[PDB]
Design a protein around this ligand. Sequence first.
Ligand SMILES: *C/C=C1/C(=C/c2[nH]c(/C=C3[NH+]=C(/C=C4\NC(=O)C(C=C)=C4C)C(C)=C\3CCC(=O)O)c(CCC(=O)O)c2C)NC(=O)[C@H]1C
Ligand SMILES: *C/C=C1/C(=C/c2[nH]c(/C=C3[NH+]=C(/C=C4\NC(=O)C(C=C)=C4C)C(C)=C\3CCC(=O)O)c(CCC(=O)O)c2C)NC(=O)[C@H]1C
Ligand SMILES: [Cl-]
Ligand SMILES: [Cl-]
Ligand SMILES: [Cl-]
Ligand SMILES: [Cl-]
Lengths: 502, 509
Amino acid sequence: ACDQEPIHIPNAIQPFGAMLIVEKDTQQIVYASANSAEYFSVADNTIHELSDIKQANINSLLPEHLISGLASAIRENEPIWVETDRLSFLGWRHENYYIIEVERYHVQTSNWFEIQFQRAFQKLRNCKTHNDLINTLTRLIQEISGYDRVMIYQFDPEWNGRVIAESVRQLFTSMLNHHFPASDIPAQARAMYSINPIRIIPDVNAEPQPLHMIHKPQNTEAVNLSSGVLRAVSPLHMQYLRNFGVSASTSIGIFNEDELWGIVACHHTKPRAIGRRIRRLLVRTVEFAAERLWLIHSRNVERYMVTVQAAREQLSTTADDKHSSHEIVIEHAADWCKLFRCDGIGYLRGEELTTYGETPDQTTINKLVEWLEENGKKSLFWHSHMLKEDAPGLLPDGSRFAGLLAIPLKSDADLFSYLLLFRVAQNEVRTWAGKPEKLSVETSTGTMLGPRKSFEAWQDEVSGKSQPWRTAQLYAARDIARDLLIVADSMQLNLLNDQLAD
Amino acid sequence: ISKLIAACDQEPIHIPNAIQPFGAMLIVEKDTQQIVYASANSAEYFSVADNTIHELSDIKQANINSLLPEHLISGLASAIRENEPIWVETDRLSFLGWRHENYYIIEVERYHVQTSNWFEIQFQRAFQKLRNCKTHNDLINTLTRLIQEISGYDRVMIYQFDPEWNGRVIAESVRQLFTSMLNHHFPASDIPAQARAMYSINPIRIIPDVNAEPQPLHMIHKPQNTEAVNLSSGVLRAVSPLHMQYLRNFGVSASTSIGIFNEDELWGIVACHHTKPRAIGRRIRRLLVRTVEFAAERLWLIHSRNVERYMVTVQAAREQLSTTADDKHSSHEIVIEHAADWCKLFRCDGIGYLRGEELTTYGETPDQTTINKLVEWLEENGKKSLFWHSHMLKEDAPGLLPDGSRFAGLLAIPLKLFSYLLLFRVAQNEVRTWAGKPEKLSVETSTGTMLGPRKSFEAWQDEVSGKSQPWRTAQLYAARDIARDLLIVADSMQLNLLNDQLADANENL
Ligand SMILES: *C/C=C1/C(=C/c2[nH]c(/C=C3[NH+]=C(/C=C4\NC(=O)C(C=C)=C4C)C(C)=C\3CCC(=O)O)c(CCC(=O)O)c2C)NC(=O)[C@H]1C
Ligand SMILES: *C/C=C1/C(=C/c2[nH]c(/C=C3[NH+]=C(/C=C4\NC(=O)C(C=C)=C4C)C(C)=C\3CCC(=O)O)c(CCC(=O)O)c2C)NC(=O)[C@H]1C
Ligand SMILES: [Cl-]
Ligand SMILES: [Cl-]
Ligand SMILES: [Cl-]
Ligand SMILES: [Cl-]
């Protein structure tokens, strides 16, 4: 019921600007935030109270270019940004309505943004690794935004997440490598980043301004405020931020194409106001950082394939030196352990077994081979990172092996042949920002589904599991294993030809 | 002619001791703080900065601290890394200064105050459009459309280099005034190596007026070192007269180009032309370079993901092969079942699988006799390799193929009683349109005698025959893996047959 709160239609705004909601076909103003008088009086003396906006003509409150744009815009939820000498308007269409946000603005011209943008592009282009990219991005967001704690928060497949990079200044504890549960950001909150990539909360304790009905709309249903920035903040998130020790907040979605991959999360210990040009500078910067990061990852994929091609050219050369596949394994199995990020290797053909590194004993290898022969066929390869779950009754009790990659090399033939790659359990200590308790009621606040009070480090453990096998490794190990098969088959064809000759 | 082209790289374009006239330039010594050079138009710019300036002679007496704003002086002093320009604006002047060895170089332009949200809206629209480009063709065409809309230049082109630094226009947005150059080939000599190198020092080059008289540098106070000062980091550096005449012959009054970098290698340039003079301010310059930079990372990401998608396709094929083989099909049956797919996967016209005396072919292949001449010849010369490949057999393997053979491409995977997978590519003769006939001009310059610019850029065709598309690396390894998949099935069946004949032999014995 965390994802059931209708945060798109709160009928209230944060007080760092005002909002109007107009009907498209009637041009009537049907809603105005309660603070609207103090914004539009900057342009018009006559406006002293909310009811003066009810007497007002939409053509007298809005710039002609805002109205023109809105009239001609084809796309819904595509905000038009229009400035006067004193006000910065952000308007867009949603169904029968124009939604218009307004903030206070004044012209002050410099080359600061262009200089910051050039430096950000230069630093990001010189990142060659994932680590360098992410830490550079946090430093840049912190320079540009002035917030005291800037984090990169990456989602896992369950929408749990982790802080993986961080620039944190002072007054703030370090959240780096802390885990957060999925409840901290419910699905409709994640969804908002696809509508507007930035979310700004200049002041956690600013009181929200409700939307008042001005002229009677044709349809009474709440209006979706999703594309702007003024949308009021769910009280559960406000309190979560208060518990986090946060007074202002800003997050930017990190998108891998359409996929929400992670988030730049920025916190400040005091209220802090950053304008439209800073918000856009931040979003442009995150967009360039994300492209570059996906490019680093994609290039690492090619680079790995080059590494595997090198290992196979090394293997073909040992084989040209007339060595048996048994001898190839003893020669190269340690390089393979790096290539495959595994702890041990068994190569099996018929009665013959060759091992390297951390391996179950020969008995257990034979029981795995038999089990795979009976229950693991019908697969190019069989893998597991939770071996006791996935193939019980096999390992001895208390065994430390948790991962297995198995490449079958024969089928319906005279003997069995496998390449086996083993991973020991890695018993990972996860640090959580407070115990990830499933929500019920928080008795300190008397809140149904309330957030945890404390984000202080809390450690748990998941055992009996290894790294999952990457797709790139599955195929590279199948390729390596089948290189051995070709060697062994060549030698068995020689031997068999001789014996049939006799 | 080779010598005349090589002499193009001789002109030291980094030290012309002159500037384009859309600004002014001062050069100061770092240790002595004295002004050692001033472009000849300095006084019309710095008279805005000091009322006592009325003439170039007045710079000789002037103190630097009254000519440059405090932020620029502090910034240049505190500047550690060379060739990193500092951009400082005043009310009326836009300054740009950097340090090069023992000099500060300062360019100054006239400045028009921008008070709108235009640039930020353009940045948002450009990035939105580039982020939504998911193919190579979409990216490059969207890029030229954005560069033309932002800059207003009448012709924008993406010009990609080949490994020999010739190039081709691969995308274009051109307005009614100019002739289309799409798919036209230009030779390397159009952009000498020194010229290609300048993009690494400043990614943008700006020539607002091809007929603007360049302003020489005047010595103010004597420098310790009389060598000409390197001007490469700025934008005011005067243009080679050979390239100005080139642009005149191209019918161009103004140009701006932005280098396209893939990491540290110059992969091409965005070239923009106008039929009248056209200056672009510092902000438009930055918006251009930032857009080209976001677009390139996008393009490299698109290519890199294409390799990933190609490997997914290859693995889906190899899984299909495995499904067929587990129905106890022979290798020749598998080749007949899947070779039409393999021809797409490998973009080839034909495939042959050879195993001892057996040959299976699909699509266009040489005849059996030629296939045996290939196989036998490969054993002599392809023993040292994992695969062997050529996209011009008649050069890479002279005398091998019969006279008149349609075939130009060969990818051969050895499997052993010989066994091979052979992948064949028909010659696809390729007509190239060049921008102008190759004229062998000679021109006597100051730096020596070198190639003069072409006078005509009209379409001139030539033709490359006897070649196929070149084999991509992803295809070499994919084909090798398919081939060895076929080897493994064939070996399995020979092993089965051998064990049967052996068990029968021992039974009869
Ligand atoms: C039962 C509902 C719950 C809930 C709701 C909720 N949360 C948000 C918004 C955000 N939550 C965030 C969480 C984090 N901030 C961090 O800094 C980190 C990690 C370092 C995490 C995990 C963030 C970032 C947001 C976005 C807003 C922001 O930037 O602060 C919403 C949406 C708020 C709104 O826009 O109205 C909602 C409804 N959170 C829970 O914990 C439970 C109780
Ligand atoms: C013997 C010397 C030669 C020579 C010299 C030269 N050329 C440049 C600069 C450029 N040439 C360019 C060529 C093109 N513009 C296009 O639009 C296309 C194709 C669509 C090509 C090939 C370009 C782009 C430049 C950069 C400058 C610009 O953007 O216009 C220089 C360096 C100029 C300078 O920066 O001082 C020099 C020395 N060109 C030859 O033709 C030979 C004869
Ligand atoms: Cl905004
Ligand atoms: Cl602003
Ligand atoms: Cl500039
Ligand atoms: Cl400007």
